[PDB]
Design a protein around this ligand. Sequence first.
Ligand code: SF4
Lengths: 303, 51, 49
Amino acid sequence: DPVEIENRIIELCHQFPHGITDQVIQNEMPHIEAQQRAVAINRLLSMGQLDLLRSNTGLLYRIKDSQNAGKMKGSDNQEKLVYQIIEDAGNKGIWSRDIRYKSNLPLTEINKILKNLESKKLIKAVKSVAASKKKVYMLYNLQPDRSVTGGAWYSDQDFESEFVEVLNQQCFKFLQSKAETARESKQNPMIQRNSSFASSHEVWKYICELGISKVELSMEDIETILNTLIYDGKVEMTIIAAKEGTVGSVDGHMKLYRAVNPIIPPTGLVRAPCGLCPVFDDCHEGGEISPSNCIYMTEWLEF
Amino acid sequence: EAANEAGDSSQDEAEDDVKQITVRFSRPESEQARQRRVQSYEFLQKKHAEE
Amino acid sequence: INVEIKKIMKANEKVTSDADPMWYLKYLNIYVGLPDVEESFNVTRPVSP
Ligand code: SF4
């Protein structure tokens, strides 16, 4: 009786929620040949009560998620036929529009399904900080990915410019003080350069000791802040070879940051009103915009 | 050709190509698309091969 | 007006929307009638060419 075989396979899948191999089924039921087991598995897959997984150990057969229920009003079929791609999205989330498009259902049905799932604590809706258009839906147990939502800089879908400005100012002050101490040490140029260098872990621990904000700042956060400072033309980073130490971030490589003065002072072009003029293209000898009747040069000479 | 592609290196490391669960939605197919699938050549060939 | 219009109506007798299934609009039979004028307030009247 193949029905008994299917029932036994379902019971075995109930016993092992993580899935069962063919070896487990053969050990539990040795008197049945491999062909009958294969036919039973094919029927179970055709009727939609089993799922196949390909692991490094082989094939696994897992019972389809039906016990985990959040929307029992109506049909469990649509509940699982939404929770499927809900879980498939998982940490990255998925907007309600994309859920509707993948489900090929009207907006009312999917709205009811999402509400009922939120009622029984199966899905959580979080606001997409990348593009504040709709609320993406994720699994309640899964931790929200920092890229799609959250972040040490984003606070309630609002970029904190003051926070990053304070971070940049404090890091630049620390690096400038370190470089000043290295210069005043004047023990040896190599020693001076090494002491002017500051590791990412060191400045990260310094910022943590400062405690400007309540949110915990990881090492890579301070690394990105220092990279933005590099892009500002104020500090310099060097990658040295160090196998292991107090940082242990990059394999065999450590980033050292030092405050460096600019190459040249402001050029002579910016000291003239013509170099900073926004309507410089419309300049002409005889016309409405002329150097003789210029307002910029007038205010500049008056000042 | 697939074997030759896999054989680009003499010793192939154990690939961590675990089959992530790509179970697709059994989307309710529109009647027009269902009729297109029924009238498709692959469906007719499969129905012939069923015998 | 006597045969072809009925065939055209039969070709598009049923129209329905994808959203909210089990809803439909079914045409049964179409008539052209006699020429009339809509001059009168909500009332028709025979009119000569
Ligand atoms: S408006 Fe005057 S200052 Fe400005 S670009 Fe023209 S000439 Fe130069």
